[PDB]
């Protein structure tokens, strides 16, 4: 199978260099870079694949019977002789900005609410109120939710005061905030990637790191520990997920993990099982003797990896 990108990439090579440059101009620079890397790394079409991409493009061309030109100039020239160039350029810019500002509105709705809020946190409360009004009511609420109480209250107060409904400047405001995203990147800054490394590190090493960060900042340490939280107590993970783990992990591995686990952990991991299964697990735990903690920790790490995979699949929430 050939992915949709690869078919498009092969078509981009096939359509010619001048057409490819025109498409690059008509499209996004990230797409231009992706196509350039693809045509540099390796060609995406084989003889069967080239046949498939060319055939599907042909079926697209049959269906896209344009009987028309892009006329980004030719259409205007026909309009200009009939009515004059002036009464079209401004209205056209306004229409494009309306398409552009709606595109930005949808993009902000799709992208993460707290990221949008912090991108707009420094901005004007009037800006926040008007963008909230323009956004979807789910999205507007999501940006509003994160804000501090005072800023949020000022935002709702200014929502009513926003009666000017201003129009070219709003589009330029969206343009200004748009140009800041490509520099933002980030990803490395967020604590959770650092927190995952702490889980990956050697037990005593992350214990020492936890002590050191508690000395550095107790609040930050508590936040990272809350990020740590994975089946250390019943309420955070819930009895249904406790049942889910036991039916998805080997019983011997679960018992070996429970050897070093707390008695509340054993109780929470035995309540879900039936009477027979709970009795078998308890008898096995009682009969099995002491084992070197390295194997217990390795099996616990494997079990927690299974838990993380389940959370990534998203069957149930943890925390």
């Amino acid at each position: 199978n050939l992915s949709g990108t690869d078919k498009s990439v092969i078509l981009l090579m096939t359509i010619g260099e001048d057409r490819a440059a025109e498409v690059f101009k008509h499209l996004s620079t990230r797409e231009v870079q992706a196509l350039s890397t693809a045509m540099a790394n390796v060609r995406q079409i084989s003889n069967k694949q080239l046949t498939d991409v060319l055939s599907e493009f042909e079926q697209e061309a049959e269906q896209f019977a344009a009987l028309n030109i892009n006329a980004n100039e030719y259409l205007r020239s026909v309009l200009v002789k009939a009515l004059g160039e002036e009464r079209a350029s401004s209205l056209l810019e306004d229409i494009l900005e309306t398409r552009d500002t709606t595109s930005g509105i949808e993009t902000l709705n799709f992208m993460e609410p707290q990221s949008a809020a912090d991108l707009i946190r420094d901005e004007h409360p009037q800006i926040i109120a008007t963008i909230l009004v323009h956004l979807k009511r789910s999205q507007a609420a999501d940006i509003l939710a994160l804000f501090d109480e005072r800023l949020r209250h000022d935002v709702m107060l200014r929502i009513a005061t926003f009666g000017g409904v201003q129009l070219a400047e709003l589009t330029e405001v969206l343009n200004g905030l748009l140009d800041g995203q490509n520099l933002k990147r980030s990803k490395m800054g967020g604590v959770r990637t650092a927190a995952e490394i702490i889980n990956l590190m050697k037990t005593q090493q992350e214990e020492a790191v936890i002590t050191a960060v508690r000395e550095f900042d107790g609040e930050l340490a508590q936040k990272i520990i809350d990020e740590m939280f994975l089946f250390e107590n019943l309420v955070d993970v819930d009895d249904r997920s406790i049942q889910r783990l036991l039916q998805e992990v080997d019983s011997e591995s679960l018992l070996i993990a429970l050897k070093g686990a707390e008695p509340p952990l054993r109780e929470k991991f035995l309540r879900n099982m039936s009477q027979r299964a709970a009795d078998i697990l308890r008898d096995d735990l009682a009969n099995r003797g002491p084992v070197r903690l390295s194997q217990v920790e390795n099996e616990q790490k494997a079990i927690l990896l299974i838990v993380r995979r389940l959370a990534e699949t998203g069957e149930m929430v943890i925390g």
């Binding site: 420094d122 901005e123 004007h124 409360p125 009037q126 800006i127 109120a129 008007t130 000022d154 107060l157 200014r158 005061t161 926003f162 009666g163 000017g164 409904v165 201003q166 400047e169 330029e172 405001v173 200004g176 905030l177 800041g180």
Partner: protein, 281 residues
Amino acid sequence: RRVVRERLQALEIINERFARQFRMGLFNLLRRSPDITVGAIRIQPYHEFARNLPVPTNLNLIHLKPLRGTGLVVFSPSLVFIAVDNLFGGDGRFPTKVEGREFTHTEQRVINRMLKLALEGYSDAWKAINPLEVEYVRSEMQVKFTNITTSPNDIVVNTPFHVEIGNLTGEFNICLPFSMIEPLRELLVNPPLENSRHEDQNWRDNLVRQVQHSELELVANFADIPLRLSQILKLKPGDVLPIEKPDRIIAHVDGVPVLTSQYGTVNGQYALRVEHLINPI
């Protein structure tokens, strides 16, 4: 030690007309008529102006060719807040105050529109009398970073303005070094003059026609000998004082020499025979 004094006439009218131009510009920009109250022109050292400057506030550099040096303008955070919310149509009855926090990108952009509008307004207002191009150089946050003047004690001229839009108020200043206007120090003192048409010069020529009818008293000098007041005290009537040969006579009116001349005996009178007019060119 640094002292300067003067009195100004023309720049007051210049500021008033520029303020009217700026008021109408802001009216058309924000679809709402503002009001600008020009404060009394301030003359103070640079350090005094910096101390009086309310930090935080945005300062901007606008060069004035061909005169060496850069002009300075400032705008209050209250003014930028009110202007930007009016641009958004906000009432402004729930205002916010930001201190130390640098202006965002959008806020700096709105400041850029105010900067360009003010630059255009002052350009037209100033060129209405004297053509001096104004070109923005660089905005600044802290006054110490502006460091326009050679010394903090350097005396500078500042023009304050009080700008309001309905209930919303505000104040911004335009401050200039005195060295910026030192070459034009005589011009700014002089009030603006109209006309200057072709009939204005022959009007000056008309004044010249009046001037030919003038009365002048000459002074004739023979000897200017340096002596001592002790000798003067011991001098008595009948005393004689030798004098070198006066090869020529200098003629001056109230001090200013005009010509040289030779004495002569004419019709029983002390007459002088002029040689030539003294032309210092």
